[model samples]
Target chain A: EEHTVKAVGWAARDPSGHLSPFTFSRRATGELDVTFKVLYCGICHSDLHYIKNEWSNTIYPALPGHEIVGEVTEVGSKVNKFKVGDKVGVGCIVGSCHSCPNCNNHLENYCPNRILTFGSRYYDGTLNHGGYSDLMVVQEHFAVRIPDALPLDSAAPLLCAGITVYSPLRYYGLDKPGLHVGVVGLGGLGHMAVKFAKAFGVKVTVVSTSPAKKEDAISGLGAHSFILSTDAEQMQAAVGTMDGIIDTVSASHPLPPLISLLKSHGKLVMVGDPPKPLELPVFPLLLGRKMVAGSAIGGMKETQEMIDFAAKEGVRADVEVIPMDYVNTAMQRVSKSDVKYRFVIDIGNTFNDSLISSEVEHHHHHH
Target chain B: EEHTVKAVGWAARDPSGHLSPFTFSRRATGELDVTFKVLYCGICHSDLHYIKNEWSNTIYPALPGHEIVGEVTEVGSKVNKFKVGDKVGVGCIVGSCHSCPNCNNHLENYCPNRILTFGSRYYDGTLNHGGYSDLMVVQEHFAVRIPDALPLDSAAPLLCAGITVYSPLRYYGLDKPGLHVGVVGLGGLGHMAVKFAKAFGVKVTVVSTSPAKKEDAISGLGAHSFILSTDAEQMQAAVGTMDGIIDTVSASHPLPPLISLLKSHGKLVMVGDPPKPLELPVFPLLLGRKMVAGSAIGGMKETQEMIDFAAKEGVRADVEVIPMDYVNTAMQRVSKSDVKYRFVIDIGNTFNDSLISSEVEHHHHHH
Candidate 1:
């Protein structure tokens, strides 16, 4: 009942997490689907975690990429939202139980039965391959039209890193002007947070352990202030100052200081998922009626809204563009936190099907 | 520089937490003070903690009662809110810096330099004794008027327990009709939470470790449902159903179960203060965008509003009214959670200053 199209992408066959070109098959564009030729795909920290099975849920032959921006190559007969030559983007989620409250409310990212962009089984019993590949066939509902104002390469990271911070800011009401917001960590999501917060006219403060990022955060990213988390004086000076904090650091860290930075009724929103539970003291939360909340990547509607907002506000990720072959090195750099902010793979220019036969270790091939 | 008034109350002379009558001197009514004869005072669980010095900050001869309701005996020159014959109530806070953002915004309970009603120093360098006493001379701003519709004995706990849970429900936007709320623990605060939530027309579920309270919560407390938190099947049946949870358990407990009970974007507001830090897993909060917040008692304005609302709604604490002489035994019973919701001392009927000099161990006369 299904037709297949031959595609090629770098895949990690084992836990060694080494990326090698391999051929895969995708379903033909269905009546509600949009088929797009991959242009740019950003390397996310999650991709690195999944390829190495750090979270212990990796499937073999993992083709990891969710921050995908592409050009529509074909549209199904019933797809009204996009046509050939349209720019589009796909993020962490591709499908969900459409009738559930989460999906019905456009919060597909939180749906229990939601399908991930990579390493997740679709309804048809096929493993979904993400946008490290040359082509992507996604349902029209999940594909957000990339605005003309955004560059496809730089906008790739916005699909994941951008919306992760943006949704929390908007949901927590930290996007309003004159509100002081602290962005914890200075990586991919953190940089986008600073840009978006600055665009919203909020006083942005970058809270990090690294002193070296102070200049970059303030001068490069246009943040209003920087606080060294290790400095007692710096932390104390800004105590009870922020209205909200966007915590983007995934590493295990103390939260008391971050909680202290917020004013009464302040919010500390966690977007990063630390492996272990964080020690949360109850007294601090009670004294000021403060809150500690967590948010994941937003729903499809909000994701598209975020993309459009990012375009209008000129909020693009500070990204380093790399060739498709450079993904392994890029992954290493991502692991060491060496990338400027994000790395977008030039899949349109550097990825090809010819390399699949040359790199395949197993004898499996399309006859 | 100050005029003194002779007063007497049951005070714990040491950390042994045994109460005995002791005569003390209080400052004369200031320009903004209201002197009241305490009619009924509720024994909060915090009173036991303070008397035993369990929280490590108790002063000698500590008198601990913040849930105080009284009849006004004298009003200061500048006290316009109350007159000599008016009924008034004072809760956890007695003073705060009126200029801070928290105070200006009517969140005095969160003010940094706010003075606790007991065991805290006033600006005039005198210790503020609480209302387990014969008299209370408090700033008029901190005194809430007791409505004629509410009974004094049953309304005493509303000053503390009622407002603590009520503030969070209103602040977190969980007071809307048709919302489903869970009340964790079935003690003083929890019962008030259920009553207030029910009054707001929310569906109330009592989540408790005690299966014995199931009948009492549904039939006695008028809760819509009861979930035995210890029973996995019961807990699982109602998972992802609550809009908010008012957690009133002071003992350290796991948060994952309560976090699981909430719907997406749900709030778990903690009105209880556990001595140790709780382990908060990031994954669950992220998946549902859930929050864990903490609230102290409501501010003075909100406390008055809560009192008025309780009066209008006929919401009163289920109390065991005891004579002043029965307080030590009542404290023991409260420590054991033996009281039905609250223990209110009948100060008007049983307390007397004549017994103070006879029981005084160290003679320190007011003359």
Candidate 2:
């Protein structure tokens, strides 16, 4: 008896409700979609936002995970990039209209018709379930082939967090050697940033408000030094020094002091979602010809490249693997900033149980 | 016998009085300083702020003019850049330590020990008289060599206004050809910005709130097109299209609207001195990866390059030259925005008259 696999996902009813478990189904393979047996999925902070309806547009009965890693179980007739038994992964985007100019340039993240993995409307106005389940169906263009050298469990977060930090550093020429790079915040994003900057042979400095994170920042993330931003003496001494700073703090912070830390013609790239408005004095930016910019996740091409680079450099997220039933608890910990780095949900065991149970139910109902 | 020069200048009397005619002495020549036979000095808007003591630290008997152009009358023994019969110019700065990191890099304008031409004390605590007077003495490093091909009267304003616009454009890589550039005002600074952008072979668009200045902007400055920002339809049609916008509007205008005019990765360079605080939105900048930056005047090296560029391109301000006695009238007219573009005061006639009259009086008294 052949039956589609089903899995439980946390769903939110409204902006003020808690996310509870709900069952969802995946569609059969189409001509251009690749079906993957989900192995592990990393919980991102944005997943908590969608689950809690913090962004004000969450769909009910929604699934919310994007940093996905899995193995290709089957491919459609037109798919050529991946084959059966090959490890693959998917990111924030599951599909996009490939004919637009932005899509043609491989910038699908900015494409007008791009589809997010969860809580986003498909062409028929139906909600798409994300990788919080046992399987994922994505268009061939949005799937990334994972390098065999990288462990799937630890490499899960690279699909989103790794590329989010890597893309801007590459675009701004920070990948070049000998640049003095600064990473603000010591969370999941900052850890990846420090590792990537170190891999690029740049002088990496980690800035944190907490003095206790200094030793961990240097030893754990391979940061060259640590600067306590709350220490005025340290900040003043480091002024006019950095070439680029990756700001990952998501709350309201003074950018002028960070801008002052930059040398002439330096840049500050923001990846965090700070809630309040940023106040920056115009004279500080003008005096040194500095720049302040922001970046999101990367496109499919760059995401694959990031995976390959991480594999070569032996870089992976410090992740804690947990069973699928622990997703709600994991999300709460992530929302509270209590997770060590990332929590990847193991999906293989859940997929096996769900497939067996669903098949039994289907035979009983229709025999 | 040399005589003292009597000139009408705005003296800061207890930070609140009107300027009156004051007498001051001019040295013939020194071993290092060169005497400039002043011809025309342009009035900057900063003069009004300094004269009215708005900055709260104005020095008395402050002659506030730095955009100076004149013929070189006498040079010291060490003056190798200019001769007795050469046209020369001076800008905001008069001297500096000439040995600090900023000064060694030819960024004397930002040097801590630098002396501003007006309302600043020299090394000896002597008050420096600016170009509002009949004559000015400055070090040779501060005097830029003006090309003979350019008219001194028209080229005077370029010493300040031209370099203020030119430096940032060059620094931001807009000096190259084929870049899309926008000038966001039609006054003295904006006109120079248009000329510079056009000279750099960029596609120039003039953005102004005044629809009446559209024709003048297009024909008078050779701008490629005009954008009337007050027209909602026109602004909406041109949103998110420009690559670089040189904003010279000196008012507390909202910068977010202008920043929205920039495309992805576009830059908005500001050069205005609005008295009030500017309210800026950060989301637009972050989403588009856009930048809002400020730039002051050029360094001495870049100022020379700007003068040379102006000479080669045959660019000069449309200036109204007034006699030295008409300083008050010129200031009032400039305050009302009544001048065509810039007001340049003729200083040579007054300087010569003061020299002859004082010499006759001194000789009679001695006999």
Candidate 3:
């Protein structure tokens, strides 16, 4: 293992799972790999869950972040698509089997043996850490290019939170104009869903348990309307109105109303992460040919396409930029649902522990 | 309503829900209607619930039968499609508003105002009865013409049970060659799904809780394989193997494993009538991009296409035919799950109470 650079990131070791500054070595660039110094990384809900060991699959000192954006510092000998100083991105997937049918097609997200960005082992028996780091070495094909028209601050989330909703809209045929779409929950994924649906020329309605979100969903987010999920009359008034719904809620709840909110042939595409089961009433689904489908973060190629689509539509996530030291506080705030939308870390400046160490040892630096 | 014909049938008048001799009046044939002399009517599980008032929406003296087959006895002056002897069928739906989008699109089965064949009001304020009677008059549009290749007794189930599975297969894109499909039950709807899927060149597997069904599912029904759903090992071996599963179990069960059996983008279409909601672990659905969809009996136009497809493929439901006097015992047998697959009442010969009344009046005239 040739270590070309020492990277700085926050990691959680035991079950207590408090993230703190940590140092690790990144492998030297190979012919098919591109190395990038991360400029910004978004705090995702999964980052909180993974670091907290909620799912109980965390590797010790696990680094968790997938909504990553950066500037390329080095490329492999055979790399052609990217070079030093180019803007790029990496998403939830860091590796995938390249020989299967799903591998060749643009659907590696559903592949059987997909490798995650964090908490999973890479092909070479090395622990793969996520974007909550200073530098990352990724296979060339697995990385995406940040769109030219997009800002770096709000663009990191397009890799995970954005593509999670975008791919489903494109795959499920919900991107069509004049289609009425309902968005359940108003979290990271849900907000992006409403934006993406609206950009597709589809009418958007936000369905939420918090009626306080009604104004923001309508005025702050450009949604057409908002339905209070707890209000039976409000839900009844909009029954069978939507062509589809993207359920971003991760908690246990009744799904009957969502089915009824759909018209004939309507679909409910879920990207939520609730561990426990929900009580599913299937009568409404059967009577109208309604469907409830689930989707994860998209494949590598589709993520590229998604960001470009968002750029063309001038779409961006509503984010609050925070420094590296603030990530712990941000994670706590995220757990409490305290943010306006997403939180992106300023990695280039605040992740300066590597710089602080290099001050005493000048010759050790590659430069 | 102008009463011109005396019809004899059986109806349940109380919650004890015992069926007995019931005399009813049929309206004179209108310009846009057709009258059919009943030959056979297939019993559905809903009939059991409706007659027993389990759903608590039964009209007293409710005649519960939906999958009906008969011979056209008379047609209105304006009727052109059916002649005096053509075979026809009536399904669960007898009335729908013609001006709605669903009706205009030939999807009356999904119309919000769809009227049940029995226990619903007709256009002229008369209580509509089902094919449990000796005769039936239906608006010309709601009745489907049975193919000459189809036998009335076997084809009777095609109206509801057959179409219930067939429509979802077509609508969900599973009615294709080389696709793997799992039928979750081996009863009326489940058996037809296997036959229909096989006819479409699909590989069919039966998933059942009863290990006793394995031999019959594989050898008797021409299925490719069988899996005892209660066996975790068998289900484990089948994880992500099927492209879809037609879950026809009427009993509430865990939906997580069924979701696990599906490949990414696979569908679990439910046509069951479970009275309670099922516990659905949404995590698997979210990860696999699996879908849970429902389909009722098809629209009138699609129902015609479905049975035509079935007939072309030489498909028919396995049924036990019985006399009208045996219907009481047959319902009890159905409640206990003792029937082979389906039960069909031989309406014309078995229900001769109308002819008996006429015979008594003729004897009085002779005196």
Candidate 4:
């Protein structure tokens, strides 16, 4: 029997308003595309940035989630990797010109014809909707098989947060045993960085401006050491020691001190997109031959590798799961950094009654 | 029979004055140190920078020249590698704490206790003068044997310019065959970069702001192509094409344009010291997975390797040799960017009469 699924996702009707749940239909099947019934979607800080038009490039009717995890409900005629019941995932990218040099190397993230999961159009003039829905359609090349051992709710964030930090480490050969790695910040990206760095047998240290995060740094993430960046004595003591540092702070922060903490010829890779400009002093870089570089999410091939690695290493996000009906409340909480690490929406449990009930109860209680 | 030599060098007596010929004594013999009769000393821009106190850390009474090529006048009792009358050379570094981690790994340039050739001190509290003099004393560890096939004057600049450009190329694995390389600027460092890049089997491109340098770009250094960066069409055509770019421009420039010229995961290794800060846009780095890094001079071991490689490849700097008496005039010409390429001083020929006549004429003409 042939079946078609309808997806309900929040869409921005205009540039300056709230997201209203809108219904859309996905194509039944294609020989090269895999259709999945979404189980969970993780809320990223970028979602809010896009919704609020902070980046100035947001398109209206934008569907803004990429960290998607679900079970494959149907497979295309040519798809051989995933069966009807296999668990799978989709990240930031959905499609690209498969024959370009960058795309041929599996670096779709760098391809000139790359199409984003949300706010992007396909070659067929169809708008590509993202994972904040009941279903998603992605190219077979961009679909990754999630390990059966990993839970869908906790594995959703691995599509974005996990792969974003993992790709640079693996590419720079930091995955080898006995490397000394440093992770800056202790938020969503930083926590995943610590896990990956430790899993690779690297000596991990967490650097934070907030002194209160020290306890959470050591016990919560299994970090080997914590450095309070404001403490000049501690910073000076840690100077010229680290082999590499993954700076995950999104806001403009002093990078010279962190660069000074690295040994000669060490690297400082930035994974976060800061809102403002960054001013880095050149002395440390010049003297130690240090580098400051930025890396986005991984390519489709590396993303799949990241998922497999995380599953084998028993690594998953420490997430707080909320029903899809409570997405607005979750978005509000996420705006204040109030969640544990990530807020994953359980899309499979979403129903229209739940949304109305929560709205009515909130209005009655406030009045 | 052992002999003591009296040599004259251009010495800076004060911070704001020109270098004058001053006589100095050379050690007759030392077990670990070899004495060389200096024949040619390349006048590097760093020499002028030090003499003018431009770097703000220059010491007075400085003898400024380090790109040295000479013959071993006498060998110490413990000298096993170098014999009397052997052609040898000394670079920027003279000695270091050989037991430290960096030094043990042959990274003498990065050692905390490393000594520079000029305006630096030996363990015995004597000033380590440079190659501007007729004779020099250096630890055997800091000296390398020049090939008999290479001319001394031509090989002089290889001590500094060759090693400075070669170290980063080798360190970044550009020594391997079949790399697409880009060299920025066409001066001293740029010429060496093009030569080394071409010799290593890399397709070389020379990028300059001036269109007039296109002819010199191909015929002068064997560059495969030349791109005038000011041309929008050329810049756009070469976008995202280079594997690596050895940037040798000393003026502050925007890095995004250059970064856009790199392929995915490409490296932009900076060998130049730009006076102002580099403004790098984050988007180019995020999308391209590119890296912007700075590299200083090579370690002692790599410096020796560079010399040996240059000798084997028959690589030598295109130099204009002038008597040491013309160093002041040469420095002025170099500061104005008037020289064709490098200026190597024939130190031995300017011993007494040339120095005396120049000093008399300089004072007589000025007064």
Candidate 5:
């Protein structure tokens, strides 16, 4: 009654998070599915967290990738959005119980039974694999049509990093021009936040702990200003100026200084998932009537809109492209905050060239 | 030429927070001022904190009261909002830098140099005393008109406790009918929150630590439900149900459990000033796109609107009317959370009978 297609990628078997060749199977294209040959997948910090079981929910042989872009190879009977050879993308989510209130409102990202791209169970009672593999079978609703103007390699991170920052910016009303916004931390999500906020015509200020990131934040990314958070004078000078701030730092940090930066009725949105609790002083929030909020990746409708807008705005992630074989080394570097912003594995060429023979041998043995 | 009018009140002279007969003087009506005879002043928890110097900002001989209702006895030549013999109320604020953006927008509550009713220096460099005194001279802009339908004693707490809950409900969209709201703590602010939220036609659940408060919350206040936070099963069953929550507990409490009680995109608005920083877990906020916000007493414009609304809806704070001599005991009971909701000092009757001659003696000595 059912069948599967052979697939190959890298997965971590334990907490050591050492990625090795993972030979697996993906379900045959369903009535409302779009099957794609993975072209490029961005390596997000979340991927690193999951592979190492840092979140404590990762299953053994966990394959981690979510910011995925590829060429569609097949479309099911009900898939009208994509055709063979068309570009497609899948982000942090793949499936959800469509009847839930969150899903009905286009907020599948917060659905109770929504399935993540990896380390989550699918509706069919199987552990799902992510886009680190050479192929992906996703429901048509979760797949976005990648515009022809966008390059697959650079567009990869947008699915996760782009929408992660974009949704909060839009949802929190920080997208309005003339509003001043602060982007904390300068990694993948922060860089994209700067890009999107700049494109929205909002004044951008990068607040970071490192003095070295100032040039990259201002000159390189075209942010209007930089605040050295560790410098008391610098932090004090900019107090009560920002309209809002998108905090992307995952490490534990003090919040009072950041809360002080907001004007009355301002918002401080946390997009990063810090592992531990942060100390929140209630006085500042009360005095300024400020808010501390959190958001994850956006809904399906907004993700598509974000991608389309990014393409029109000429916004793209600054990415370092690596071969499939270099992913393990890339993961280690990512662990050290070593990448420029993001890493995209070149799955189309390297995946086929390096693993085709081995994949075939595994397929032969399995058959 | 400025003139002084002799005034009498109960004031705390030290950190012991014992209130005794004290005499003071108020400035003559200025070009934009109104002078009123204090009728009833509600004792707020904040008054207790400030009198004891718990916030470390209390001035000696601190006169602490803000929820003030009175009849206007005099008005400046330039004042247009009120006339002699008009009923008026003044809350936390008395003066602000009128040129600032917050003041321009009628939000004097957040002005950088906002002058509190007590413990703050006025523009003329004199220490501002609050409505615990026999008379109050206030800037016209900071005064709100109390409706005739609302009894002055019951209307006393609306200026502080009532609007503290009312504004957040309005601003955060928790005022919508059928929205489920939770009120934590059953003291002055919490009880007012329940009353206002019920008036808004929203379903209310009183979340409290004391099991005894359940009957008071449901049967007395008409809250639809009650959740004993100490009971695990009760807390777990109500997870992800509230549209918003008004937290009024000033003491330190764990927030993760309260955070869990919110639905996706739910708001937890804190009106309480917990002195220390509370532990805020970032993961829950991110997962559900939830927010934790804080609000103080509302702006002068909104304060007027709140009193008008409360009067029309027949909403009133449950109060134990006390004489000026019983204030110290009232403060002690308020500290222990023993009062039904609030304590209103009968300033019109008791303040004059007890201290009028002693105040005149002090006035004679000073002269």
Candidate 6:
């Protein structure tokens, strides 16, 4: 029962660590699976989290990548949706208890028994690697089709950063045209939020602590407005205006004021997870019948819809494509929020021997 | 405009204060007013906060009872729904700017210019009084009819506690049959939440820090089950089971555990306003596609519907009724969390001129 398909990807050896190449065997395309040749992998804040073990669930030699865009190399006999050479993508979730109600509803992101693409165990206790690899074997149910209208490079992040923000906007009713939406921070996800929100025809207001992002918020991201969240007058000026906000700031910050900025019945939805619990003041929420809700990534059915929607609307991530060797630098830049929007790893040019050294190669198999 | 209608009430004079007899003037029945003889008034946590100046917004001689149930003494020339001797109640809000959109929608509770029953000025530059008075002159818009099927004493708390919980259940989509809902902290609001949730046909689970409330939660309140929040085993046992939860506890508490108690897309709604921000862990919320929301007391239209629904569903708050003179003791007991659910003042036995001593009367007039 040993898996035999070979794949190569970058690996993190330790916490907040550097990344180098590692060779591994992936599952041979099962009847229920679709095998694909990886073309691009989007760098996400979560990739940094898993690589550095910031979430404390990291396995050493942890291969990270979920925002995947690739070409279908093989499809099992039962696979009907995809074919060889078809553009395809895979996101954070690799497997879920398909028997659960959420799984039935296709919302596996919220499934209690969901398995992540990376840093999670497969059914038989094998490691599930992500998209920063030469090849990937995906459950046919979890694979998404990338439209020809969307580029594979930018569409890579749609698997993750795109859907993480996309799901909330749709579920929270902020996708309604003419609605005012406030994006809390301008990072990988936040940038995608702005793109999706603007494309959805909602009035997008980027709320960032850094004034430096104001230009990027309005001009580059196509937001209608940008509020320097630290400016009391600016926050106060927008009071009771926004219908809803997608809060993407991972840092724990004061929320009472943000809660106040919303109109009655306004919703402030959080997508990013801070290390500790953020302080949530209840007065504004109670008084205004306001909501502070959270949304995980979108479902597989909706992920396809999101990608299709993004392709149609010309909504794509602002990514800085990097070579496979630059991932360690990318992760460092991601840690400091130094990347312009996203650092997409070009897995097509993965250096096989640079990381196939004697000790590291031995460490890959033995460790 | 010195409309004189005399009423007597127990008033709190200063910070961290107690109650004493004070005479005040309410408006004569105007074109849009409905006058009532106060039969009962429910004590609320907000009343305690205001009287003690905990929120730093107390007015001298503060007459603080908003949860009012009474017999309609008179109706205005234009008032039609409330005739003399009709049963009535008034909740947290008495007046709001009639011109606002929310006012049109009957959501004046969130309106910026909304006036509280007590400690807020009416539109005419007059300080509004409370239901602790022998009489009340409420605008026609704010009054709700207590159905003949409902008792006034127990129904008094419905104005505040009842509607507070009832409003959120409906708005948050948690009022459906067979939905498992959690009630956090079994206080006045908590107890009322249990009654309403059960009445709505949703299975109710009470999550309280006090194991002492377990018996009352299940047997007395008609809850299907109860969980002692302090017990790790108890909390662990109930993970990912709830559909939604109404967190009635205003005290700051950890929300990560509570968020985990819900299934995906589950709601954790806060009705109580904690003084400071509670620690809100975002990981659980984001991971589960769960929501953390807040709701205030119901709107006027919904308030009327709640009582009518309560009447039909046999939902009522469990109350400890005390005479007007016992308000001081009741406030102390309330502050100490010593009551079963709610403490309501029996204004039917209000002391008028009995404690109207010369010094006290002068201070009442001056203050």
Docking verdict class for candidate 6: medium
Q: Tell me the tens digit of each residue's lDDT in model 6 across B247-324.
A: 988777878888889988899999877767787778777878778888888889999999899899888788898877
* Residues B1-367 of candidate 5: C-alpha lDDT, one tens digit per residue: 6698888888889999999878888899988899999999999988888889987888898999999999999999999989899999999998888899888997889898988898888877898888898899998999999888999988999999999999899999999899999999998899999999999999999998889999999889889999999999999999999999999988899999999999999999999988799999999999999999999998999999998998899999999999998888888898888899899999998987766454433445554
Alpha carbon deviation, residue A28, candidate 6 (Å):
1.5
Off by over 4 Å in 3: A1-4, A15-17, A353-367, B1-3, B353-367
Which has the higher TM-score value, candidate number 3 or candidate number 6?
Answer: 3
Question: Cα deviation of A234 in candidate 6 (Å)?
Answer: 1.7
- Fnat values, one per model, are 0.98, 0.40, 0.94, 0.46, 0.97, 0.94
Q: Score the docking of each candidate (DockQ).
A: 0.84, 0.44, 0.81, 0.55, 0.84, 0.66
Error of 4 at A265 (Å): 0.8
- Writing each residue's lDDT as its tens digit, candidate 4 over A243-279 gives 8999888787876788889988789998886765566
Model 4 misplaced regions, further than 4 Å: A1-5, A351-367, B1-6, B26-28, B356-367
Error of 1 at B346 (Å): 0.9
Clashing pairs in 3: none
The residue pairs found clashing in candidate 4 are none
Error of 1 at A87 (Å): 0.5
Which of the predicted structures, 5 or 6, would earn the higher DockQ when compared with the native?
Answer: 5
Stretches > 4 Å off in candidate 1: A353-367, B353-367
Best by DockQ: 5
A best-first ranking of the candidates according to their TM-score comes to: 5, 1, 3, 4, 6, 2
Q: Candidate 3 lDDT, tens digit per residue, A140-161?
A: 9889988678999999988899
Ten contiguous residues minimizing lDDT sum, candidate 4 chain A: A353-362
Local distance difference test, per candidate?
A: 0.91, 0.80, 0.87, 0.82, 0.92, 0.86
**Deviating ranges (above 4 Å) for candidate 5:** A356-367, B356-367
Query: Can you write out model 6's per-residue Cα lDDT over A145-228, one digit (the tens) per residue?
Result: 988999888888888888999999999899989899999988888999989988988999998888889899877877899899
Candidate 3, residues B6-116, lDDT tens digits: the string is: 887888888887888889898888897899999999999888888899877888888889988999999998999988999999999988998898899988988889988
